[PDB]
């Protein structure tokens, strides 16, 4: 029974190979007692609940591990609190970013074998996992999550590292931006549940405009785009153009005072860094992945932006599976379930002789 762990910038997704969905999804947050031994750690929602008396760390805010004691706490919580397994009994598949530093892959491997005593483990690139989950071996993955977005071109099963672009905003930025534009509209979010309220407004009411200026006009001229939202305390507020302006920052990072290219352009640019002969296949298999690609309208608008950018006879297909919040996780579950996968794992035995660098020869 293999386990599948997707270490997300914001959210950790964890589960059992063979299941169609993660059994556990929790925030990648570690909480430590501000003032020690006057009255230890907490992970996930419990750390959030108790944040008033905790110092909270985010050990992977941009997809890469910045703190190994806190990452270890996250894994301990994943194993013991969330999945309730003994880790020494399960092969474990873990995901990483495409450009995960070489020392990080080795550290992750070391921790699994030495700290959690896993009998087997494997590290997989997230974008390749989403591609697989979509039933493809070639395509470009546009993954936008919580603290990190990337475009990863993949040809016949393997990412093209030289063509990977790290797009500069994600979910957090969009939540921050939804808060600011709601404040400006007249509203005030002052409780400790402010982030959460605005995140939820983002998740339930935001959409991506097919033609943004025409939407701005429709909205300035009528009331047919507006939506009511009921706050925790029963107060009802109205969400107008904020619904589409917020995710628009994905296409116009300038809204956030950012010089960076938007998601359609980052996508283009990646395709352009690839052998000319494979680009047609990239354009015809643009796969959307991650929470921040969940906005309604996002596929149409990507189709539109990339049509505009590519020669007019280019066949553009955008693939936005409804389950794309978990595409990475689901790719991992399918991979780790395959009859041919027992040969792929780094075993304990292999670890004990090669040590942690075995990862660069086993996992790519």
């Amino acid at each position: 029974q293999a386990l599948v762990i997707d270490n997300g910038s914001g959210m950790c997704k964890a589960g059992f190979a063979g299941d169609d969905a993660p059994r556990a999804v929790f925030p990648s947050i570690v909480g430590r007692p501000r003032h020690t031994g006057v009255m230890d750690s907490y992970v996930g929602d419990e750390a959030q609940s108790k944040r008033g008396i905790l110092t909270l760390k985010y050990p992977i805010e941009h997809g890469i591990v910045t703190n190994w004691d806190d990452m270890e706490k996250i894994w301990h919580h994943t194993f013991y609190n969330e999945l309730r397994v003994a880790p020494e009994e399960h092969p474990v598949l873990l995901t990483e970013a495409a450009l995960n530093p070489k020392a990080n892959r080795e550290k992750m491997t070391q921790i699994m074998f030495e700290t959690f005593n896993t009998p087997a483990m494997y590290v997989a690139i997230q974008a390749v996992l989403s591609l697989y989950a979509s039933g493809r071996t070639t395509g470009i993955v546009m993954d936008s999550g919580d603290g990190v977005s990337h475009t990863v071109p993949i040809y016949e099963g393997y990412a093209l590292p030289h063509a990977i672009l790290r797009l500069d905003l994600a979910g957090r930025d969009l939540t921050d931006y939804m808060m600011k534009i709601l404040t400006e509209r007249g509203y005030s979010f002052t409780t400790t549940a402010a982030a959460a309220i605005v995140r939820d407004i983002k998740e339930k009411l935001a959409y991506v405009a097919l033609d943004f200026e025409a939407e701005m006009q429709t909205a300035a001229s009528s009331s047919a785009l507006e939506k009511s939202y009921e706050l925790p305390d029963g107060q009802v507020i109205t969400i107008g153009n904020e619904r589409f302006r917020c995710p628009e920052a994905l296409f116009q990072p300038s809204f956030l005072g950012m010089e960076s290219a938007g998601i359609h352009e980052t996508t283009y640019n990646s395709i352009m860094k690839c052998d000319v002969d494979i680009r047609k296949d990239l354009y015809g298999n643009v796969v959307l992945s991650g929470g921040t690609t969940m906005f309604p309208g996002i596929a149409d608008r990507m189709n539109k932006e990339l049509t505009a950018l590519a020669p007019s006879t280019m066949k553009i297909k955008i693939i936005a599976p409804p389950e794309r919040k978990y595409s990475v996780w689901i790719g991992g579950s399918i991979l780790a379930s395959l009859s041919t996968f027992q040969q792929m794992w780094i075993s304990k035995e292999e670890y004990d002789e090669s040590g942690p660098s075995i990862v660069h020869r086993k996992c790519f």
């Binding site: 063979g18 039933g135 071996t137 070639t138 099963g157 389950e323 689901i330 395959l338 041919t340």
Partner: protein
Amino acid sequence: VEHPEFLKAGKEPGLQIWRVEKFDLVPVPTCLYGDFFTGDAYVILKTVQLRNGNLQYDLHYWLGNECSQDESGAAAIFTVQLDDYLNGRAVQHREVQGFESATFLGYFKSGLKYKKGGVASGF
């Protein structure tokens, strides 16, 4: 991979066809070749004998309109793995029901046929 079927694959000129059944690669009876369950995904290897003595490989993964996510995902993956196994020598093709390349359709002398149903998801 020590999968018995990888050991059988690309050994001589020919067509081989496997069905994804529950995260496994299961060979299709040669008498049923060309009859595709639209609720299934399959891996097809076409080995052609070249003038040099070496064999050419084209690997097609065929996706039924109703195959489950685990089956289409496994077909794509098995394809990558079989290609790695054949020293990267296979050209990989994604074949979708109703949109198969002429090359793929060409493999089937009495024309390929669709039939409803298949093996259940492995999830």
